[PDB]
Amino acid sequence: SNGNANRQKMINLMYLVFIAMMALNVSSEVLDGFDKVDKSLTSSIDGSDKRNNLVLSELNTAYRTNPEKVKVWYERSLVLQKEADSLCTFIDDLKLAIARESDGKDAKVNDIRRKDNLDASSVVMLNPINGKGSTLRKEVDKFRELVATLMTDKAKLKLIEQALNTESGTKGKSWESSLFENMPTVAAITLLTKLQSDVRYAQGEVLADLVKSVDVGDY
Amino acid sequence: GSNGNANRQKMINLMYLVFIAMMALNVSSEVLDGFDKVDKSLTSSIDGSDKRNNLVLSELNTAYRTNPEKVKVWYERSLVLQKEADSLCTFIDDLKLAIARESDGKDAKVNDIRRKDNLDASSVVMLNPINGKGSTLRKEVDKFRELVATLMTDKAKLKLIEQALNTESGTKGKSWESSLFENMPTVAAITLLTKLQSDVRYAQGEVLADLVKSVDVG
Amino acid sequence: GHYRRYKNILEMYLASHKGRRLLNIVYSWGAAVVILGALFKLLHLPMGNEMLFVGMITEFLVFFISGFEKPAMEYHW
Amino acid sequence: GHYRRYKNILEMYLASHKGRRLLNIVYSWGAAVVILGALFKLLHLPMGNEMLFVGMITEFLVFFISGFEKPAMEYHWEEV
Amino acid sequence: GHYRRYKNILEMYLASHKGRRLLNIVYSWGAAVVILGALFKLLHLPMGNEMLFVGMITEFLVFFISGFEKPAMEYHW
Amino acid sequence: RRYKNILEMYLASHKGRRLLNIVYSWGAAVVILGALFKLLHLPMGNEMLFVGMITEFLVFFISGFEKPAMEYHW
Amino acid sequence: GHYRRYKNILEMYLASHKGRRLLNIVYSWGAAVVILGALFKLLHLPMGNEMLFVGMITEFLVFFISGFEKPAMEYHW
């Protein structure tokens, strides 16, 4: 059912244009913007890590002197830190995996990611066989509402927290594909750095509110 | 002519559509939108850092109110730091409204409203010899680094790091105010200026930390 | 039988001039809609994402109904 | 009753050499401008989209007006 | 050795009229399935990746097997 | 404009088409290989896109003047 | 300049009945491998980055060697 004189020509032309069109991406200035943004994001995650590791010291000192007042608080802070740090370690290992997939087995992630491939973040995230995205989705979901079950959440209180590391996306697909499908490699590391950033922010806020509640009873 | 084949034609037949769908998936990616999410996270970091450092400054001025004999120059210096950093960040906040002005309309928002990502938007606002504010931006943000360097008591943990984002001297060829954004979409510019504001508040945080450790020991 | 009735009536329909003329019309208009949708999605223009799907559905229908027909001849003369 | 009964005359141009000439020329020029627009689309050069637009719109118009060419006969042969 | 004594019964069936129809028909719904699966992948609706997979496998098979056939024609005057 | 009939008969010439077909095919090949280099960050690959796309533009532009193969009735 | 002798003998070989048969195999198998590459890239199958490489290089060769085939118009007045 094909005898046209020009439809053949147009399908060949579309073939040429779009097999060539596979090369496109955001301009090299955009990727440089991504890199320069997530450098600052790394600075922010480092700052938040120092901040909350610092605030844990007051919990330690208070538990040294008055443990019976924090039997319900110090252990929950410890666990909260345990799963928060486990999730962040998983994110960091996953970022290293994406970087290794992107350039090569010898590639590093911090600055040595010398590539911007699109099909190097979906492969590690949207993998039908062993895609870590679903595991990441479920683990970040587990970390979510765990903060809710840790302090009496309110709208004025930490409602923006679970409103920050959400799972909602464009109708139909969650952010297993709304954050890692056909985006340039550097964008993937940048967004995973964002995930580390906002899990650190969530952790800082929840240790802040638990220590505030501790002070309420202690005062 | 220059179209015919033998059996690759069926390959041609079914694949121009599949490659078109692949391109549609490629274009529909959130790479440009992905600046929105980093914008939100950076904004949360900005106002959190603002709360923290203004709390530190509040403690500092509370300490001054009782006994001013120990600390006067550091107090006045910290207040000048607050004034100048607030001036810079408020200037940048009032800025980046202009880039949003023709982004979609005069009623635009610098929160999530972009409504499109056009390349020919930032050069006409900040890379012009008439209304381009890039020279003003450059010669105002260099003021911050020179004041946090020359007036300060610089040390390894002090201002030897934040120049990675307070560059003020980019790569060869394109100028710094153009190297940051020469051909670059709207929301990318707002996110970058957001990161500038976050970096300014960050540096203010370390400077107030230095003043706190100098007054407690002093 | 019942499904073969529709199969055979459609097979005849895709042989008559009017039916085959409609096939040619859709065969070209779907390609045109595909071009326009690819353009509009590529350039990030409003209300272009949909017609890409419209053209893609059109081509799906063409490939579907293209199966009931017999393209075959051999010269050897 | 003065807008629809024009396909009969429009098909005459398609069967005419001048119509074939015009369609082939507009097609080939459109293909060339589309290819060069694709070049300026990959390589982030100034006038990429503004000209990919005109190329693909001309191509779309060509196919919009070329959908009326009825004759595509299979031409069965009943010989030996 | 006996390497070639496994594929000597396919060349005549590929050009067989009953076989040409089978090859073209499996190609036809294979392509239709690919198009429809791509459509679902574009719309984010579920159960499109599997249809992409089966369509790609079907096309790979039909194209690989079609590699054993001998067409030839030419004119002069 | 002027006497482009020489180009017109060159395209219809039995020797013109072989050059036309080979330049089209080799332009397509270099476009594809240049794209392949581009999404692999390989040396002198980004340039090869230009030499292929310009080749495609030239071949289609010169092809714009050929006499079309008129359809045959029976 | 000596390569033109290689290209001439290659061009006359491609027209041969024994050789022109191989053209069908290379076309069809290149089509199959580029189907596989497009599937791997489109569905995110691991280690498909090499699969995409081989698909692109194979159909690049397909385009290149297609530059030696010679078509004819043979207009009937």
PDB file of C-alpha atoms in Angstrom, chain A residues 14-184:
ATOM      1  CA  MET A  14      12.667  12.945   8.245  1.00  0.00           C
ATOM      2  CA  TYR A  15      14.878   9.914   8.845  1.00  0.00           C
ATOM      3  CA  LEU A  16      18.006  11.923   8.082  1.00  0.00           C
ATOM      4  CA  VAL A  17      16.993  14.984  10.091  1.00  0.00           C
ATOM      5  CA  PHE A  18      15.859  13.044  13.146  1.00  0.00           C
ATOM      6  CA  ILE A  19      18.672  10.495  13.246  1.00  0.00           C
ATOM      7  CA  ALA A  20      20.870  13.582  13.192  1.00  0.00           C
ATOM      8  CA  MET A  21      18.445  15.317  15.565  1.00  0.00           C
ATOM      9  CA  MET A  22      19.339  12.768  18.260  1.00  0.00           C
ATOM     10  CA  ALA A  23      22.521  14.752  18.892  1.00  0.00           C
ATOM     11  CA  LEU A  24      20.814  17.818  20.348  1.00  0.00           C
ATOM     12  CA  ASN A  25      20.690  18.889  23.983  1.00  0.00           C
ATOM     13  CA  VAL A  26      20.687  22.092  25.984  1.00  0.00           C
ATOM     14  CA  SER A  27      23.561  24.380  25.044  1.00  0.00           C
ATOM     15  CA  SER A  28      26.966  24.044  26.677  1.00  0.00           C
ATOM     16  CA  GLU A  29      26.171  27.183  28.666  1.00  0.00           C
ATOM     17  CA  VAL A  30      23.172  25.407  30.217  1.00  0.00           C
ATOM     18  CA  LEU A  31      25.286  22.422  31.285  1.00  0.00           C
ATOM     19  CA  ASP A  32      27.856  24.814  32.730  1.00  0.00           C
ATOM     20  CA  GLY A  33      25.008  26.451  34.626  1.00  0.00           C
ATOM     21  CA  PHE A  34      23.999  23.044  35.972  1.00  0.00           C
ATOM     22  CA  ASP A  35      27.557  22.389  37.137  1.00  0.00           C
ATOM     23  CA  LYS A  36      27.955  25.800  38.737  1.00  0.00           C
ATOM     24  CA  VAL A  37      24.608  25.444  40.528  1.00  0.00           C
ATOM     25  CA  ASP A  38      25.291  22.019  41.954  1.00  0.00           C
ATOM     26  CA  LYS A  39      28.728  23.104  43.168  1.00  0.00           C
ATOM     27  CA  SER A  40      26.835  25.519  45.422  1.00  0.00           C
ATOM     28  CA  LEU A  41      24.388  22.713  46.186  1.00  0.00           C
ATOM     29  CA  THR A  42      27.324  20.596  47.375  1.00  0.00           C
ATOM     30  CA  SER A  43      28.455  23.507  49.532  1.00  0.00           C
ATOM     31  CA  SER A  44      24.950  23.684  51.008  1.00  0.00           C
ATOM     32  CA  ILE A  45      24.760  19.953  51.743  1.00  0.00           C
ATOM     33  CA  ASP A  46      28.149  20.145  53.453  1.00  0.00           C
ATOM     34  CA  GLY A  47      26.948  23.080  55.544  1.00  0.00           C
ATOM     35  CA  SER A  48      23.748  21.304  56.566  1.00  0.00           C
ATOM     36  CA  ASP A  49      25.733  18.176  57.447  1.00  0.00           C
ATOM     37  CA  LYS A  50      28.049  20.166  59.703  1.00  0.00           C
ATOM     38  CA  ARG A  51      25.061  21.959  61.241  1.00  0.00           C
ATOM     39  CA  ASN A  52      23.049  18.893  62.209  1.00  0.00           C
ATOM     40  CA  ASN A  53      26.086  16.855  63.270  1.00  0.00           C
ATOM     41  CA  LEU A  54      26.801  19.848  65.512  1.00  0.00           C
ATOM     42  CA  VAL A  55      23.289  19.974  66.964  1.00  0.00           C
ATOM     43  CA  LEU A  56      23.504  16.257  67.791  1.00  0.00           C
ATOM     44  CA  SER A  57      26.172  17.174  70.369  1.00  0.00           C
ATOM     45  CA  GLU A  58      23.631  18.966  72.567  1.00  0.00           C
ATOM     46  CA  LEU A  59      21.456  15.842  72.507  1.00  0.00           C
ATOM     47  CA  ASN A  60      24.513  13.840  73.559  1.00  0.00           C
ATOM     48  CA  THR A  61      25.341  16.191  76.442  1.00  0.00           C
ATOM     49  CA  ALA A  62      21.744  16.278  77.675  1.00  0.00           C
ATOM     50  CA  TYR A  63      21.555  12.476  77.546  1.00  0.00           C
ATOM     51  CA  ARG A  64      24.769  12.281  79.592  1.00  0.00           C
ATOM     52  CA  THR A  65      23.233  14.176  82.520  1.00  0.00           C
ATOM     53  CA  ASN A  66      19.447  13.644  82.315  1.00  0.00           C
ATOM     54  CA  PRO A  67      18.734  10.479  80.312  1.00  0.00           C
ATOM     55  CA  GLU A  68      15.306   9.742  81.816  1.00  0.00           C
ATOM     56  CA  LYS A  69      14.025  12.976  80.262  1.00  0.00           C
ATOM     57  CA  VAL A  70      15.154  11.854  76.789  1.00  0.00           C
ATOM     58  CA  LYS A  71      14.504   8.103  76.836  1.00  0.00           C
ATOM     59  CA  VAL A  72      11.872   8.823  74.162  1.00  0.00           C
ATOM     60  CA  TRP A  73      13.971  11.401  72.284  1.00  0.00           C
ATOM     61  CA  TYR A  74      17.643  10.437  72.028  1.00  0.00           C
ATOM     62  CA  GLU A  75      16.997   6.978  70.573  1.00  0.00           C
ATOM     63  CA  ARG A  76      14.587   8.382  67.985  1.00  0.00           C
ATOM     64  CA  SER A  77      17.154  11.023  67.047  1.00  0.00           C
ATOM     65  CA  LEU A  78      19.751   8.263  66.652  1.00  0.00           C
ATOM     66  CA  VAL A  79      17.525   6.164  64.400  1.00  0.00           C
ATOM     67  CA  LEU A  80      16.392   9.217  62.408  1.00  0.00           C
ATOM     68  CA  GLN A  81      20.059   9.941  61.745  1.00  0.00           C
ATOM     69  CA  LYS A  82      20.653   6.275  60.878  1.00  0.00           C
ATOM     70  CA  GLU A  83      18.085   6.045  58.077  1.00  0.00           C
ATOM     71  CA  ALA A  84      18.766   9.618  56.912  1.00  0.00           C
ATOM     72  CA  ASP A  85      22.475   8.873  56.512  1.00  0.00           C
ATOM     73  CA  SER A  86      21.736   5.485  54.939  1.00  0.00           C
ATOM     74  CA  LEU A  87      19.491   7.162  52.363  1.00  0.00           C
ATOM     75  CA  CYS A  88      22.122   9.804  51.626  1.00  0.00           C
ATOM     76  CA  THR A  89      24.814   7.125  51.293  1.00  0.00           C
ATOM     77  CA  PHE A  90      22.565   5.280  48.849  1.00  0.00           C
ATOM     78  CA  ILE A  91      22.106   8.510  46.889  1.00  0.00           C
ATOM     79  CA  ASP A  92      25.862   9.129  46.787  1.00  0.00           C
ATOM     80  CA  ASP A  93      26.612   5.568  45.667  1.00  0.00           C
ATOM     81  CA  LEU A  94      23.895   5.864  43.027  1.00  0.00           C
ATOM     82  CA  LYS A  95      25.366   9.160  41.807  1.00  0.00           C
ATOM     83  CA  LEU A  96      28.768   7.495  41.532  1.00  0.00           C
ATOM     84  CA  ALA A  97      27.112   4.667  39.595  1.00  0.00           C
ATOM     85  CA  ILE A  98      25.558   7.149  37.158  1.00  0.00           C
ATOM     86  CA  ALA A  99      28.890   8.921  36.705  1.00  0.00           C
ATOM     87  CA  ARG A 100      30.673   5.608  36.102  1.00  0.00           C
ATOM     88  CA  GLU A 101      28.037   4.609  33.545  1.00  0.00           C
ATOM     89  CA  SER A 102      28.254   8.021  31.863  1.00  0.00           C
ATOM     90  CA  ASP A 103      31.970   8.253  31.058  1.00  0.00           C
ATOM     91  CA  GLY A 104      33.602   4.988  32.109  1.00  0.00           C
ATOM     92  CA  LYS A 105      34.639   2.667  34.904  1.00  0.00           C
ATOM     93  CA  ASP A 106      37.490   5.022  35.869  1.00  0.00           C
ATOM     94  CA  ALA A 107      35.359   8.186  35.883  1.00  0.00           C
ATOM     95  CA  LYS A 108      34.826  10.152  39.092  1.00  0.00           C
ATOM     96  CA  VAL A 109      31.697  12.154  39.964  1.00  0.00           C
ATOM     97  CA  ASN A 110      32.710  15.218  41.977  1.00  0.00           C
ATOM     98  CA  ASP A 111      34.028  17.319  39.087  1.00  0.00           C
ATOM     99  CA  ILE A 112      35.545  14.716  36.770  1.00  0.00           C
ATOM    100  CA  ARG A 113      32.222  13.926  35.089  1.00  0.00           C
ATOM    101  CA  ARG A 114      33.428  14.885  31.604  1.00  0.00           C
ATOM    102  CA  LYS A 115      30.197  14.097  29.782  1.00  0.00           C
ATOM    103  CA  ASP A 116      26.558  15.149  29.369  1.00  0.00           C
ATOM    104  CA  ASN A 117      24.916  12.026  27.921  1.00  0.00           C
ATOM    105  CA  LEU A 118      21.136  11.821  27.987  1.00  0.00           C
ATOM    106  CA  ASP A 119      20.992   8.014  27.868  1.00  0.00           C
ATOM    107  CA  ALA A 120      23.239   7.616  30.904  1.00  0.00           C
ATOM    108  CA  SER A 121      20.798   8.493  33.704  1.00  0.00           C
ATOM    109  CA  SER A 122      17.699   6.724  32.407  1.00  0.00           C
ATOM    110  CA  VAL A 123      19.752   3.538  31.994  1.00  0.00           C
ATOM    111  CA  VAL A 124      20.564   3.542  35.702  1.00  0.00           C
ATOM    112  CA  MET A 125      17.144   4.868  36.793  1.00  0.00           C
ATOM    113  CA  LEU A 126      14.558   3.661  34.269  1.00  0.00           C
ATOM    114  CA  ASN A 127      16.057   0.199  33.955  1.00  0.00           C
ATOM    115  CA  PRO A 128      13.346  -2.465  33.504  1.00  0.00           C
ATOM    116  CA  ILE A 129      15.517  -5.178  35.084  1.00  0.00           C
ATOM    117  CA  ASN A 130      17.296  -3.593  38.071  1.00  0.00           C
ATOM    118  CA  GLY A 131      16.455   0.104  37.923  1.00  0.00           C
ATOM    119  CA  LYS A 132      17.369   1.752  41.209  1.00  0.00           C
ATOM    120  CA  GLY A 133      14.707   4.417  40.652  1.00  0.00           C
ATOM    121  CA  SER A 134      11.885   2.319  42.083  1.00  0.00           C
ATOM    122  CA  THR A 135      14.081   1.386  45.045  1.00  0.00           C
ATOM    123  CA  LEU A 136      14.914   5.071  45.465  1.00  0.00           C
ATOM    124  CA  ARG A 137      11.227   5.971  45.205  1.00  0.00           C
ATOM    125  CA  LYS A 138      10.235   3.485  47.901  1.00  0.00           C
ATOM    126  CA  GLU A 139      13.125   4.386  50.212  1.00  0.00           C
ATOM    127  CA  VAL A 140      12.500   8.126  49.990  1.00  0.00           C
ATOM    128  CA  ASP A 141       8.818   7.337  50.611  1.00  0.00           C
ATOM    129  CA  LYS A 142       9.859   5.346  53.706  1.00  0.00           C
ATOM    130  CA  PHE A 143      11.961   8.262  54.950  1.00  0.00           C
ATOM    131  CA  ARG A 144       8.949  10.466  54.263  1.00  0.00           C
ATOM    132  CA  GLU A 145       6.130  10.274  56.868  1.00  0.00           C
ATOM    133  CA  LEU A 146       8.785   8.807  59.141  1.00  0.00           C
ATOM    134  CA  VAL A 147       9.539  12.414  60.031  1.00  0.00           C
ATOM    135  CA  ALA A 148       5.764  12.828  60.345  1.00  0.00           C
ATOM    136  CA  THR A 149       5.620   9.935  62.812  1.00  0.00           C
ATOM    137  CA  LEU A 150       8.474  11.586  64.750  1.00  0.00           C
ATOM    138  CA  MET A 151       6.957  14.950  65.724  1.00  0.00           C
ATOM    139  CA  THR A 152       3.427  16.365  65.819  1.00  0.00           C
ATOM    140  CA  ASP A 153       3.375  17.705  62.264  1.00  0.00           C
ATOM    141  CA  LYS A 154       1.348  20.843  61.561  1.00  0.00           C
ATOM    142  CA  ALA A 155       0.847  23.283  58.702  1.00  0.00           C
ATOM    143  CA  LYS A 156       2.786  26.030  60.488  1.00  0.00           C
ATOM    144  CA  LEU A 157       5.128  23.226  61.578  1.00  0.00           C
ATOM    145  CA  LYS A 158       7.032  20.928  59.227  1.00  0.00           C
ATOM    146  CA  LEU A 159       4.363  20.467  56.569  1.00  0.00           C
ATOM    147  CA  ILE A 160       6.594  22.047  53.917  1.00  0.00           C
ATOM    148  CA  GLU A 161       9.070  19.226  54.588  1.00  0.00           C
ATOM    149  CA  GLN A 162       6.962  16.430  53.108  1.00  0.00           C
ATOM    150  CA  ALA A 163       5.801  19.128  50.692  1.00  0.00           C
ATOM    151  CA  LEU A 164       9.454  19.423  49.596  1.00  0.00           C
ATOM    152  CA  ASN A 165      10.662  15.845  48.996  1.00  0.00           C
ATOM    153  CA  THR A 166       7.363  14.778  47.466  1.00  0.00           C
ATOM    154  CA  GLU A 167       6.571  12.088  44.913  1.00  0.00           C
ATOM    155  CA  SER A 168       3.950  13.968  42.887  1.00  0.00           C
ATOM    156  CA  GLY A 169       4.676  14.573  39.214  1.00  0.00           C
ATOM    157  CA  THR A 170       2.895  15.302  35.970  1.00  0.00           C
ATOM    158  CA  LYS A 171      -0.292  13.231  35.811  1.00  0.00           C
ATOM    159  CA  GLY A 172       0.619   9.673  34.891  1.00  0.00           C
ATOM    160  CA  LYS A 173       4.233   9.240  36.008  1.00  0.00           C
ATOM    161  CA  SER A 174       6.092   9.797  39.274  1.00  0.00           C
ATOM    162  CA  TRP A 175       9.604  11.242  39.460  1.00  0.00           C
ATOM    163  CA  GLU A 176      11.265   7.944  38.690  1.00  0.00           C
ATOM    164  CA  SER A 177      10.897   9.294  35.142  1.00  0.00           C
ATOM    165  CA  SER A 178      10.067  12.958  35.804  1.00  0.00           C
ATOM    166  CA  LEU A 179      13.620  13.506  37.076  1.00  0.00           C
ATOM    167  CA  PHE A 180      15.780  11.037  35.141  1.00  0.00           C
ATOM    168  CA  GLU A 181      14.323  10.385  31.660  1.00  0.00           C
ATOM    169  CA  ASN A 182      16.389  11.704  28.739  1.00  0.00           C
ATOM    170  CA  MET A 183      18.044  14.418  30.732  1.00  0.00           C
ATOM    171  CA  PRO A 184      21.737  15.254  30.331  1.00  0.00           C
TER     172      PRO A 184
END
